[PDB]
Design a protein around this ligand. Sequence first.
Ligand SMILES: NC(=O)c1ccc[n+]([C@@H]2O[C@H](COP(=O)([O-])OP(=O)(O)OC[C@H]3O[C@@H](n4cnc5c(N)ncnc54)[C@H](OP(=O)(O)O)[C@@H]3O)[C@@H](O)[C@H]2O)c1
Ligand SMILES: NC(=O)c1ccc[n+]([C@@H]2O[C@H](COP(=O)([O-])OP(=O)(O)OC[C@H]3O[C@@H](n4cnc5c(N)ncnc54)[C@H](OP(=O)(O)O)[C@@H]3O)[C@@H](O)[C@H]2O)c1
Ligand SMILES: NC(=O)c1ccc[n+]([C@@H]2O[C@H](COP(=O)([O-])OP(=O)(O)OC[C@H]3O[C@@H](n4cnc5c(N)ncnc54)[C@H](OP(=O)(O)O)[C@@H]3O)[C@@H](O)[C@H]2O)c1
Ligand SMILES: NC(=O)c1ccc[n+]([C@@H]2O[C@H](COP(=O)([O-])OP(=O)(O)OC[C@H]3O[C@@H](n4cnc5c(N)ncnc54)[C@H](OP(=O)(O)O)[C@@H]3O)[C@@H](O)[C@H]2O)c1
Ligand SMILES: Nc1nc2ccc(C(=O)NCc3ccc(Cl)c(Cl)c3)cc2s1
Ligand SMILES: Nc1nc2ccc(C(=O)NCc3ccc(Cl)c(Cl)c3)cc2s1
Ligand SMILES: Nc1nc2ccc(C(=O)NCc3ccc(Cl)c(Cl)c3)cc2s1
Ligand SMILES: Nc1nc2ccc(C(=O)NCc3ccc(Cl)c(Cl)c3)cc2s1
Lengths: 252, 252, 251, 250
Amino acid sequence: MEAPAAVVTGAAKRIGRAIAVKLHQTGYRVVIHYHNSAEAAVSLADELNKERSNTAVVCQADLTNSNVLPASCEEIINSCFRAFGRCDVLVNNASAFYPTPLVQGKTVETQVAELIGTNAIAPFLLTMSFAQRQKSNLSIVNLCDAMVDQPCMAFSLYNMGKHALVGLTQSAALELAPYGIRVNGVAPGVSLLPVAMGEEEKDKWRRKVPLGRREASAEQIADAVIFLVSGSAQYITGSIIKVDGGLSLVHA
Amino acid sequence: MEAPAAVVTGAAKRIGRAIAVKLHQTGYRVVIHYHNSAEAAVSLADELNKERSNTAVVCQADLTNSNVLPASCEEIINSCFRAFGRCDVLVNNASAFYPTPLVQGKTVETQVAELIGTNAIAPFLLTMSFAQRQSSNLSIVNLCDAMVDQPCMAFSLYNMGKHALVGLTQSAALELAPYGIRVNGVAPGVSLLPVAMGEEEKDKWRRKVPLGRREASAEQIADAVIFLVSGSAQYITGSIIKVDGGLSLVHA
Amino acid sequence: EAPAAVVTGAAKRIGRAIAVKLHQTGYRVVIHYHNSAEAAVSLADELNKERSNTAVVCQADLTNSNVLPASCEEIINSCFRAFGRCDVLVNNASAFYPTPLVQGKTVETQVAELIGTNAIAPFLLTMSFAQRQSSNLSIVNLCDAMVDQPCMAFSLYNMGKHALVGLTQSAALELAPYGIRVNGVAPGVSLLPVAMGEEEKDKWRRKVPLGRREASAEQIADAVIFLVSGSAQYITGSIIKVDGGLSLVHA
Amino acid sequence: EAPAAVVTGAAKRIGRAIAVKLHQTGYRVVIHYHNSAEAAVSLADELNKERSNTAVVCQADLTNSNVLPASCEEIINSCFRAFGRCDVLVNNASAFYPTPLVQGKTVETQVAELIGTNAIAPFLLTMSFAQRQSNLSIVNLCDAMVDQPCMAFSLYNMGKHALVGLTQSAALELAPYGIRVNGVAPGVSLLPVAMGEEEKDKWRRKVPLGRREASAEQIADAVIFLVSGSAQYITGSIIKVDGGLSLVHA
Ligand SMILES: NC(=O)c1ccc[n+]([C@@H]2O[C@H](COP(=O)([O-])OP(=O)(O)OC[C@H]3O[C@@H](n4cnc5c(N)ncnc54)[C@H](OP(=O)(O)O)[C@@H]3O)[C@@H](O)[C@H]2O)c1
Ligand SMILES: NC(=O)c1ccc[n+]([C@@H]2O[C@H](COP(=O)([O-])OP(=O)(O)OC[C@H]3O[C@@H](n4cnc5c(N)ncnc54)[C@H](OP(=O)(O)O)[C@@H]3O)[C@@H](O)[C@H]2O)c1
Ligand SMILES: NC(=O)c1ccc[n+]([C@@H]2O[C@H](COP(=O)([O-])OP(=O)(O)OC[C@H]3O[C@@H](n4cnc5c(N)ncnc54)[C@H](OP(=O)(O)O)[C@@H]3O)[C@@H](O)[C@H]2O)c1
Ligand SMILES: NC(=O)c1ccc[n+]([C@@H]2O[C@H](COP(=O)([O-])OP(=O)(O)OC[C@H]3O[C@@H](n4cnc5c(N)ncnc54)[C@H](OP(=O)(O)O)[C@@H]3O)[C@@H](O)[C@H]2O)c1
Ligand SMILES: Nc1nc2ccc(C(=O)NCc3ccc(Cl)c(Cl)c3)cc2s1
Ligand SMILES: Nc1nc2ccc(C(=O)NCc3ccc(Cl)c(Cl)c3)cc2s1
Ligand SMILES: Nc1nc2ccc(C(=O)NCc3ccc(Cl)c(Cl)c3)cc2s1
Ligand SMILES: Nc1nc2ccc(C(=O)NCc3ccc(Cl)c(Cl)c3)cc2s1
């Protein structure tokens, strides 16, 4: 029907939820993708459907790289067409994030599949599927990282995956421009800190941020996604907007 | 009375005009700075005042580097406070743009004063005067250039000024973040081309743009300015948003 | 006495010029190869005629798989076996071909080759090299000066070269404590793909500001030699373009 | 004969180590200086004692003004007068001090010194160099920290950003004349004379590769590479020589 539709990956919680909520408030129908967070995904879709019925569905998939990842990414895009008859927007938000020291219970090949698959390869396959299933304001927004050039110690694979995501953003903006598909990124600095992190460590990171000495709210991240998908960004493609309160400008 | 106020330099025509219009449509009172274009600046102020009385004034100043530039820039900022009692937004838009070949009727020192004054020095002095004078959403937007790393041939002084403006955007974002003043840029690729440029040459440039094979409208550039000054960008500082249709991604 | 270097993809073209120039500088070299056995041995024979027992070959497929970590460990081990030390790693081997987003290897094979060979193998080699460690230890990654203005329909290739920039910076930071420097060399057009038409080749040569020609392989190798030398002992996390200005040229 | 190089601000510290190392490589040198007349003439004496007639000094103020173009023309002229050629220009001279946005020198003077020395004088020297024209090249001393700048150094940071633009624009424009243009970007090298030793140590401790500043010689080594025949295909490149400092997050 006549409301546009969006896919948001890793949308059960945290930033991906804030993006799906804000898209839904702007008038989109949404596919809430999730991996393990089944209860949180269904609860969000229920909340959205209560606000406007038949406007949210969930879709489960592991985005770890394997020989079936192309099928799973094809299926995520397929689920948006099955529910809503169209797919206007793809938000690549799902991400694995953990250290992989170079000088050192997962195997290294599992670490590569997870950190490179979720951060880079699944975005590429979803982009291919999104583009191939096209028949309006079509675009993709990749969630990138403002600190990719000043990386955390011992996170090489995660950093490699986020750099690859910058290259995807640029390559796909170039190649999909003739189809009228825009491809942009939003690059948080510190936003919602990891659930595992102690308050004392959270505050150490907060104190580094020039603009307010605090992390970004999930909603502040979502605001920049909403801008890039909007008609106010219709000439914008291949741009990555930092939303980092100045953190990347701060020297050691 | 409770409306915020903005200074836009070089606002009589083209991009600066569209930025002043869009700020006014959003509810800002505006200072329309101009250098030579008196009749166009006053025409715009009159059109805006017809929409809402006493919401637009003009301010004449040459932004060429000289001994008097600091006083001129102080006076532009002062004009905003005298008209409207506050100054919430500064837009550094005014720009000289012409070739300065390295190998061979203005002298080179005049080219330096104009190209480095308008593009860099005047922004710095206006940023100083804006900050010295300071519900609040204070910010500065500098009009940058998406092609600064792939410059037009024989434009070294222009390119130097626009790189210096990147540095200003970054340095002032860091330094003004404790005052709650955000500093950002918008970087066009090809937007409004010269009226007197032959269509055949205009088309050579338009054909290079992946997204639509056309230049950006002034309004499309103004849209990204409006985003950055808005409450939707309240964690964004030190960022430069390209608005270039993918132009900067295209190899030779 | 003499230091030792591993050069991946060293049988031909750029990696060959790198191995030769390292050898000429006094390194012992491990010439890695995948399919190019005859050429790898040919170069080792040429080097060993110059100084005996200074060049060995090492076969390995650098495609991503469950066995890549073991293959990468073996490349590094081969250097230690032959020469008792490994001072320099040059990650030069690379797959290069288009992978259009909008439509034969399967996609997941193109991922294994383009991301495995250009990024994951460099990462695992870097891990094996650091694990096995006065001296001047460093790693040099063969990057691409055109990574921000990529060729149309080369997304996987571009992703892998961007990942290789991130590896260069992450490993430079993490290995600095061990005195291991990590840097890159980023060619523009050098030796054009054998596949490529002559007409397409001249089209590209014409774009290059500095002399309207491609880099020779030895011009690339010159920047590698600089980065491994004692004249670069404070340089880590740097990527030196060697592109004749190509990446400065607008559309 | 031997090639000739101009090194601006060559009396002391990094510019001095660059002049020494070019001279050791074979070059005749113009040692440009502003205030450091004793140190300039003393280096030139040292170099000439090694090889007679291979070093001269040239005094000039690189502050921006309507006579800066004549002064930069004079610097290039002095190389031609002494040596009959000018193969290499090193833009090393630089003013460096804070210019806070929120409040001895007027702001017009701070702009003229920080933008003139770091950017305008390089541009004018590049113009004069190119206009008077084997292995010709220019090397600009940039700054590895330009995107993670010191607090309250906007004018300095603006100048160094402009110098990056100059390096790119001049590389593009001079390539058809066979002139290469590149940069060397130190992180922390010889720390300011004015700085206390506790602040010097805070900076040293930030550097991943060795927890120490670059020697002036290590900066000069990269300059030597870029002017050498081993960098003949290199133009528009800026080499960081920063021990990883620019990689370290806040
Ligand atoms: N939070 C920050 O400060 C910050 C900073 C920089 C960049 N970012 C970027 O912003 C985005 C969102 O940040 P965030 O903190 O909201 O992310 P997050 O909570 O770390 O992860 C978001 C979701 O990713 C999904 N995910 C993880 N591994 C997966 C797999 N193998 N298959 C499928 N899905 C998987 C998970 O879904 P389930 O829970 O359903 O398993 C998870 O809820 C990410 O791209 C991130 O890298 C965030
Ligand atoms: N148009 C494009 O494609 C494009 C591309 C990249 C970047 N940009 C940037 O976007 C901004 C707006 O572009 P535009 O094409 O609208 O600019 P423009 O028409 O070239 O110039 C804007 C105004 O700048 C003012 N200006 C010029 N020299 C001045 C001086 N010495 N003192 C004071 N004001 C002076 C002039 O005002 P008066 O007319 O009143 O004298 C002029 O109308 C500029 O910063 C530009 O560099 C534009
Ligand atoms: N040529 C250029 O203009 C250019 C431009 C930009 C960047 N570069 C970078 O420069 C480096 C060298 O360039 P080049 O033109 O010399 O490279 P190339 O000829 O395309 O490839 C070099 C060698 O890489 C090895 N290789 C490819 N796939 C492999 C796999 N799955 N397993 C193991 N080895 C494999 C091959 O070795 P075998 O032959 O033994 O099978 C090949 O001979 C590359 O990293 C490249 O991306 C080159
Ligand atoms: N040292 C570092 O850590 C570091 C870090 C990043 C970048 N850099 C860059 O590397 C280069 C060399 O560094 P450095 O520490 O050796 O420089 P420095 O000691 O601060 O300055 C070099 C020389 O510049 C000259 N100079 C200053 N103002 C001048 C003017 N108005 N006219 C003419 N000359 C003037 C002075 O010459 P006289 O003494 O003859 O007056 C001075 O000796 C500079 O471009 C610098 O910005 C250095
Ligand atoms: N998928 C995700 N990507 C990222 C990227 C960055 C951050 C973030 O919070 N970074 C600050 C941070 C800094 C250091 C450490 Cl050790 C940790 Cl665990 C977290 C958190 C996340 S969650
Ligand atoms: N103050 C101004 N700054 C700029 C910056 C860039 C452009 C612009 O037109 N860029 C594309 C372009 C189009 C045509 C020609 Cl001939 C050239 Cl040199 C450049 C136009 C302007 S007007
Ligand atoms: N392993 C390798 N990596 C690279 C990277 C770039 C090039 C190169 O020649 N690029 C220019 C170019 C690349 C692709 C095409 Cl289709 C055309 Cl026509 C021209 C060649 C190679 S070989
Ligand atoms: N002409 C010159 N340019 C530069 C650029 C940077 C440095 C340097 O010392 N940077 C480190 C540093 C710079 C400024 C301060 Cl306030 C402190 Cl504490 C530490 C020193 C110089 S001297």
